[PDB]
């Protein structure tokens, strides 16, 4: 057989080989310089048209030869030198030239070949535009490039709910021209969101069908009933026809998803909220965490869709109220703007009030988000939780939001050396980014603000007042034993420091 250069030789020489060539002229020659048969002569001698015999010589010759020789010594013989020097000049820049193309661009309109055609057919969502978080999308494009070489691998783009992960992969695969076309041949982007034990099997059915050709989507069988081992085999089957394939698994919940991606030796970008599903994969697991939109980036996002920037002190402060409240949150920031009607700082602070005395439900809106409000999203993040961890969480209401407080100062409200509290609090931040770890000065945790008003109008109206009280109790129990600064152990005895917010939460539970 040939190669891909000798084949591209015989192949890209067709506006030529039709105009001045008759295959019988070479028949004898190849019948003779030992490369041909007489069933193949009679195959290419008794044919009506010459395009016949030309297709004949360019499909039969493919086989019994060991390179492209007796078709360049032949054309030099037959007064048809104009094909010969072409193909010999081409084997020249083929053999003598260790430098040719490299996979890139030699025909224009990639942006209609990728952008519309590959993205769309791989079901990639229409990337975000009016603001792009440079850093993160970039580290994504980078960390995807480092791995195009690799056989199977995981990229976990993990963060909070409404944290912006899915959007970032949308922007990271729609920006470049490398990840799709250059680094990976195709893209498959699929939403998981599975809880049942059937969600993780049904998923890989629509991958398997996401792969399959337009022929045989008609032929779609009653495949819902077919073993797990045969669907798996059927995917790695239909996966023969798919070299360097990227998989985006938008919104993973089941560690079974991850086990399947890994039994099938697949290549995965993964959007998820819970990070520990990665312990399921024994591998080059690589992770990229999407943190809260920092105070400055938030400004950028507002600026981005036309929102007017502060002046007076109690307006820049109003906007730090929103950014503090919406504990760096893409989604809710967005629910906010969409619900900011006249656009004035005035109506923005209206919402800033509405948010404190009615929770996330005060600002829930129609948004590019799949959820009316971040609370519906977090609900799920709260359902998945170890039953006991559901408890620790249900209680962190009676804490201070945006405040660092020690492990023992938490030991007061949380169920059961009370280090065990920290294990629950790590699991709690690991599984939806609900908390906040800070190793030193002293092992301390912290609860953000979106993550609080979720719990406010959501944990049991009694349990708020019970946690407030179980605290004033163990606090006064620390009482009978005898800014950029952590709260000292000489002063735990008085949470009266946060008396202000403690007084508001109390006014809530007791009425």
């Amino acid at each position: 057989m040939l190669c891909e250069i000798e084949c591209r030789a015989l192949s890209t020489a067709h506006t030529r080989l039709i105009h001045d060539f008759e295959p019988r002229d070479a028949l004898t020659y190849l019948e003779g310089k030992n490369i041909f048969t007489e069933d193949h002569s009679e195959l290419i001698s008794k044919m009506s048209t010459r395009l016949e015999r030309i297709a004949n010589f360019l499909r039969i010759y493919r086989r019994q030869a060991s390179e492209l020789g007796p078709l360049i010594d032949f054309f030099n013989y037959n007064n048809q030198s104009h094909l010969a020097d072409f193909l010999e000049d081409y084997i020249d820049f083929a053999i003598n030239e260790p430098d040719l193309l490299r996979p890139v661009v030699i025909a224009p309109q990639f942006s209609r070949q990728m952008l519309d055609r590959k993205l769309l057919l791989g079901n990639v969502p229409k990337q975000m535009t009016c603001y792009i978080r440079e850093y993160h999308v970039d580290r994504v494009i980078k960390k995807l490039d480092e791995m195009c070489d690799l056989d199977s691998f995981f990229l976990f783009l993990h963060g909070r709910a409404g944290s912006g992960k899915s959007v970032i992969a949308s922007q990271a695969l729609s920006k470049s021209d490398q990840l799709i076309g250059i680094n990976y041949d195709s893209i498959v982007w699929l939403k998981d969101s599975g809880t049942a034990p059937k969600s993780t099997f049904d998923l890989f059915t629509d991958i398997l069908l996401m792969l399959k050709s337009e022929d045989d989507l008609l032929n779609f069988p009653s495949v819902e009933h077919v073993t797990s081992v045969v669907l798996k085999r059927m995917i790695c089957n239909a996966l023969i026809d798919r070299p360097n394939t990227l998989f985006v698994f938008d919104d993973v919940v089941q560690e079974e998803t991850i086990r399947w991606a890994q039994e099938l030796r697949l290549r995965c970008l993964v959007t998820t909220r819970d990070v520990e599903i990665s312990n399921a994969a024994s591998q080059t697991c690589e992770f990229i965490e999407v943190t809260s939109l920092e105070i400055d980036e938030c400004y950028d996002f507002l600026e981005a869709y036309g929102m007017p920037m502060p002046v007076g002190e109690k307006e820049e402060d109003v906007l730090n109220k929103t950014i503090e409240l919406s504990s760096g949150n893409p989604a809710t920031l967005m629910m906010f703007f969409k619900s900011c009607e006249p656009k004035t700082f005035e109506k923005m602070a209206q919402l800033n009030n509405k948010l404190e005395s009615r929770g996330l439900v005060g600002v829930e809106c129609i948004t590019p988000y799949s959820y009316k409000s971040l609370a519906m999203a977090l609900q799920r993040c709260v359902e998945v939780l170890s039953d006991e961890d559901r408890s620790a969480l249900a209680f962190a209401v009676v804490m201070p939001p945006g405040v660092d407080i020690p492990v023992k100062l938490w030991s007061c409200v949380i169920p059961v050396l009370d280090d065990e509290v920290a294990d629950r609090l790590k699991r709690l931040s690991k599984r939806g980014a609900l908390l906040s770890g800070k190793r030193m000065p002293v092992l301390t945790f912290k609860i953000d603000h979106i993550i609080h008003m979720f719990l406010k109008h959501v944990v049991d109206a009694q349990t708020i007042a019970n946690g407030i009280s179980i605290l004033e109790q163990r606090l006064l129990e620390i009482g009978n034993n005898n800014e950029t600064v952590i709260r000292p152990e000489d002063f735990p005895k008085f949470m009266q420091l946060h008396q202000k917010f403690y007084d508001s939460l109390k006014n809530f539970a007791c009425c």
């Binding site: 709260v382 359902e383 559901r390 249900a394 959501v458 944990v459």
Partner: peptide, 6 residues
């Protein structure tokens, strides 16, 4: 009733 659904 400790939450909502939950």
């Amino acid at each position: 009733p400790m939450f909502n659904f939950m």
